[PDB]
RNA sequence: UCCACCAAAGUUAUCGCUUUGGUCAAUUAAUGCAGAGCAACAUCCAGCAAACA
DNA sequence: TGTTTATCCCGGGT
DNA sequence: ACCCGGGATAA
């Protein structure tokens, strides 16, 4: 049978035994560091050779072995067996050592001692290579297109033509036609010529641009040609031949000031990243063992650290053929447990036929994928006097994300924000050697504090991020007790109160003491305080009763408890993942509820004019989820389904101008024409019993219903929407 | 009209008994919930619930049988039940009412009034009044402080129905 | 780069519109749900500050 | 895009 | 002398 893998999310608090928690913190917090350097150092090398001689053939260096050697060079260990070294390994080590001293001096890095690191580099480095390939596939072709757009000077020509036609006073239709023909057809011809490795027609590009195309083509071999007459497809099919071409394209883009994009992937996040903890890694690093661990003893060794009796570790899946193979991933807070069934040893609704289309009578639900509203769903049986409509907005799905962003931004210490601002002042995606060195120096200067701040969950914390800070308990309008921003609990029996009349401060001090006592009893708060701190806090609370008026005890308690404000960023990421999963489940449940299990989904494509190729719209992602839940899904053309009035097929137009709701665009454009509201140009609607108003999504779904009816009756798309 | 009794101990020393008579006819749901909690037949009850809050001349409070600090408690019908009615007013001392965080947030916690509370009318449900042991109520109140903290630990040692 | 959800009315299938009533686990918590079975996770990166009409 | 597990040599310590 | 790491390589 084919190999398949499943993953289960868990927390270290639930599955990991306490005795072996601290060593893991030492492992991950180290690995995430080395891996980061394993990226930067690599790029450093690629900048020292290419900057000196572009003829350097670094394409061979893009392999897992080179990344493994780079990772090992950052680890100090006893000398090994030089006789068994391979020639490729010798060359890689010599190349690394050529710049090792310079890179260490620039980054102020010291070789970290880590025995048995060989078994670790094989995993993380395997991902590093994956970063180099996929990234190119994700950015090469598109970026190439952008360069062409800059080579053709598309924007300048469009602006000049727009000004000329405004002087001539042409209408919108005429201007758009003139552009789409005169300015685009030559651009399409040039793009096709570049795609088929052919120089574009002379006269469409100036010398300063033809030289760029010639230089870009010089990178490839004389006899090499793009597979299937498509450079875009060739890049995906044979990425190995475009690394040098991709680097040259990035250099040209930087020369032309295109939007920055990282040619060489780099790990910039300071939060510890997930790493794979293999049985061997567990044996040699977590268990601190000093002998071989075979497969037979693999499960026995694993059981000494984690509780295999938990619900997550046991078998799962149909016939329970998926078994846990002693391999998992973790970043020190969250854990992804992997299970596998194999050993570890190495269609558009318009194209449906009658027999298919006519089976959904009364079951089709038309979905408009709004840019702001993720889905606007209307059942084909909906009536004007009996609405059957649902709305799923992107804001609802991003509620947790925005909440966590606000929490992170509000709780950011002054030092941390200053360091982040200083670091961001240095360009990172640029391939310039000097700028990269400056960025490395800045990162080395700021890491000492950034890693400490973002590693507060597991790493030691000694900096006073909140000096001279006073925190007092407060209760919101919903009877929730907060310290400064931490949630303590909900006092559901707090509303009954007399007329306050704050006659004495001692009563307020007693209330503060009661709130402190309530807070200290919480399970999720006590565990965050060590025994000495808890005893000191209890002593201060006792003293407060003797001297309630004095604020020194409150200040001391606040200073002691200041540690609580350090956000558990990894816990925040885990909560975000859980919230996303729960929101998807909620969407599925709501769809099944308000429309029933018989709902059949019809989804639009885009609001832009008609296109007949890839067009990588984001909706392609969402469709993956719905089909996995059992909802039939079909596509319907949308390019012209929002231009005509459903009532009488007349033209629709935006008529209401409202203040711009987007804060970053208000100053640049205080008022904008409403997009979600439309009116029909025909005035006879008033006789039916002003113009008839419509919502963009409502009109789109009505047009989709009309198209579906036309397909059912005549098996052809309406000419109006064609 | 169900009648219930509590035997109260402070720091392990019994202090007396208090008897409440409920308004089953006018407030059936709240009275039934209070009776069920007192009996403890469903598996939980006020038995051992501390008097975590006592404001002298204002109120006594209790019924937190899961945290003992005012954050716990749950009714037999679930975590919350809608407010029943406000046909009774806090016009006399010794009236028993349900504690809540706001409109339609009644749980299992309860409070006993010691003075007229006209301002509480229309916001809390009253479902019974003290028929005996008001002296014990005053004795318990004397151990409280304006901030609500009690000078000594006070718990409902026993609860039952007559 | 701020914006939780449902319903009545201005209102005609009326908007990042307006006036009301209802919804809540709040959360720096928990692997999630059903009522013992199910559930892809991670590095890079596009998110938007618009890369292809 | 990926989801590890064995074998061999020699320098050092008892 | 003889056994125990620890790196390196390989499928
Ligand atoms: Zn019309």
Author numbering:
A (entry chain P): 103 to 448, 465 to 807, 812 to 844
B (entry chain C): 1 to 162
Please quote the authors directly.
Based on this result, we built the model of S. cerevisiae Cyp1 into the structure of the PpFz-ωRNA-DNA complex. The model shows that the active pocket of Cyp1 engages the loop in the FRI domain of PpFz1, with residues P614 and P616 from PpFz1 forming hydrophobic interactions with A99, F111, and F58 of Cyp1. Multiple conformational states of PpFz1 were also obtained; four states were identified, with the guide/DNA heteroduplex 3-bp long in State I, 8-bp long in State II, 15-bp long in both State III and State IV. In State I, the lid of PpFz1 remains in an upward orientation, and no DNA is bound to the RuvC domain. The ωRNA guide segment (C50-C58) encircles the lid and contacts the REC domain, which differs from the guide conformation observed in GtFz1 in its inactive state (binary complex). Structural comparisons of the inactive state (I), intermediate state (II), and active state (III) reveal that the REC domain shifts to widen the large cleft by 8 Å from State I to State II, and by an additional 2 Å from state II to state III.
To explore this diversity at the structural and functional level, we resolved the cryo-EM structures of three Fz1 proteins from different species spanning two kingdoms of eukaryotes: Guillardia theta (GtFz1) (algae), Spizellomyces punctatus (SpuFz1) (fungus), and Parasitella parasitica (PpFz1) (mycoparasite).
